[PDB]
Design an enzyme around this catalytic site. Structure first.
Site, PDB file in Angstrom:
ATOM      1  CG  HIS A   1      40.036   4.527 -29.491  1.00 32.16           C
ATOM      2  ND1 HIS A   1      39.396   4.872 -28.321  1.00 32.16           N
ATOM      3  CD2 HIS A   1      39.236   4.945 -30.496  1.00 32.16           C
ATOM      4  CE1 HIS A   1      38.254   5.472 -28.610  1.00 32.16           C
ATOM      5  NE2 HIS A   1      38.132   5.528 -29.923  1.00 32.16           N
TER       6      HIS A   1
ATOM      7  CB  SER B   1      34.849   5.381 -30.442  1.00 30.52           C
ATOM      8  OG  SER B   1      35.402   6.656 -30.167  1.00 30.52           O
TER       9      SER B   1
ATOM     10  CG  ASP C   1      41.292   3.985 -25.767  1.00 28.60           C
ATOM     11  OD1 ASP C   1      41.692   5.069 -26.225  1.00 28.60           O
ATOM     12  OD2 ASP C   1      40.120   3.580 -25.938  1.00 28.60           O
TER      13      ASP C   1
END
Lengths: 252, 253, 252
Positions: B231, B81, B206
């Site tokens: 995610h 991320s 995601d």
């Protein structure tokens, strides 16, 4: 004497030394990306390109002749054979080399014991073929340097054009070049270089086998080009330049 | 100015792991034993997050510089991320330090732009305001947003929530700066010219990083989509997450 | 040599046709094809009359585009430089289903002023002067396409190298091309159902800064390079490839 051309005007000088059989025209495509950040020195090595009329000579001597026309201080970048010349200069006159960059070069081209390299007799045979077939031995040795990549055809032609746009250098200059590669071994002499040392490699390089050992030259840094062979600045010009711009900055 | 940094494992090759926004290096607790024998593992809390307290908002450039300062000479860098933007930034700035770049559940440009899928700016802006006025409700909203849609979704958000509840959270300023990094940064063109291997792992479900084929057309990088992960595919699907990392070690040698 | 020379490079499954400018040939792309072959199937063309397609003569802009089309892929992005930007544009008017996107580089719809541009009588001069002093008229016209930059003399000899290594274009074809520049206006026929990317050098002598009026084409995008003249892919390679790669993201 030695064909020498200066381009651009940054305050950081960059000396670009080509490899065996070729000349400064190999830098035509990256000089535009560099000349706004450096004063650039394009050199045909003694015996090569437009610097014909030298014969064979020792690496030390080749480095003394190029040194005698260089600026006071500069980054020194050597490609392949040019990498050995640029290395020799850093060894002989460290105060002149703000930083040493070699591109797809080896401190010791010939395979030695537990050291990857070219078989000393492969290269020795390349000197014999040069006697028997001069023109086509140079073209075949340059064909080796772009092999293996997703660009090999256009890249081999860039190199081939650059040797064919000028009269062939002397056969004694080239054979001497092959001898330097066959016999030179700078691994130890560079163990304690006093200036920044940047080594660039191609992963598919058929002449310089892919680095981890020279990494273990603990002060030097290395970048491996994952999809390039022996001429990373032809196949990957934009990735090639950027660590040089970063290097100018780090010097500062 | 020093960053929380734990080196574990007894492995041949170095692997820097970087958590995402709002979290900390404990998010890796349950894949590190499966990686420990193949990598020396560098578990880092990003400046301003978790145990590297006392940092406020900073640029992605300053963030990546501070991390790189305690980094080993040469490592593989894996970013999740926002950690993916940090690792990417490191790749760009200091390629000599980066043996290979890996991002997980990560995008070069998190906000939607023209002809570019991403989080809509106003949706991001709404999340920010929600975080300001209603902190802990919005943390729970966030934890759900990383796990939503998978067979395992509640258990996975609970696992992430454990890593949140047990460490100091980042300062209000660090939080806001990191959202501002995701809002503003676009590394798309920057990463075209990377010299080293580039592996991109994605979760089909995601909801923060949309489903990949634009980025494949970074022709030298490779990408992998886990059909069933969202995610946090190293939480939801640990075994499949590590396989491409072993394959990468094979490629590097 | 009564055939259009045509070379295909790459595996990027988006196609990209590259069209050179007056006097030149596909070799002018030598330094950017490495930057782009990873992202495109590249088609390097020698316009008929030029380069390796020399066995042709004078011909209308539409004759040229029609001859160039016959060997072009089903669909492709068409990028034209200078005179080549008029062939490209013509092709995105005669058969727009073939053209996924039109890109022009340092090119104008109407080269001669009316409307800023080049005086018509000074394109009459080159045509006439071409008969009184063939070589220097070519050299002097080419020199216009690079001068105005800090790298003007490197970039200029890049273009001369590309011209000198292949048969000199016929005086007929060279006169024909100057005719196209002088006469043609395409301003009206380009008001067009594909993305239209327009690339300009701020310092371009031959192509002024008619950009801001051509921005009004309300759905054409334009990018100006603040330090480029008429040959921005030569002077500034990096800033040239970036918009191409982002255009490819905007399709697909």
């Amino acid at each position: 004497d030695i064909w020498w051309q200066t381009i651009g005007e940054g305050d950081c000088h960059l000396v670009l030394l080509h490899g065996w059989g070729l000349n400064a025209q190999v830098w035509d495509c990256i000089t535009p990306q560099l000349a706004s950040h450096f004063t650039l020195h394009l050199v045909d090595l003694p015996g090569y390109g437009r610097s014909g009329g030298f014969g064979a000579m020792s690496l030390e001597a080749m480095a003394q002749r190029v040194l005698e026309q260089a600026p006071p201080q500069a980054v020194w970048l050597g490609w392949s054979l040019g990498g050995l010349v640029a290395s020799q200069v850093a060894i002989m006159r460290p105060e002149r080399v703000q930083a040493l960059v070699t591109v797809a070069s080896s401190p010791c081209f010939a395979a030695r014991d537990d050291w990857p390299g070219i078989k000393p007799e492969v290269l020795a045979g390349f000197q014999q073929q040069l006697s028997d077939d001069f023109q086509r031995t140079v073209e075949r040795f340059l064909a080796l340097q772009t092999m293996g990549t997703e660009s090999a055809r256009q890249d081999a032609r860039a190199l081939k054009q650059a040797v064919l746009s000028l009269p062939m250098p002397s056969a004694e200059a080239l054979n001497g070049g092959l001898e330097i590669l066959r016999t030179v071994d700078l691994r130890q002499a560079l163990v304690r270089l006093p200036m920044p040392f940047l080594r660039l490699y191609g992963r598919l390089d058929g002449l310089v086998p892919r680095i981890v050992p020279l990494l273990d030259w603990p002060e030097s840094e290395s970048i491996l080009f994952d999809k390039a062979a022996h001429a990373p600045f032809v196949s990957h010009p934009a990735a090639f330049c950027e660590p040089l711009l970063a290097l100018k900055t780090r010097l500062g």
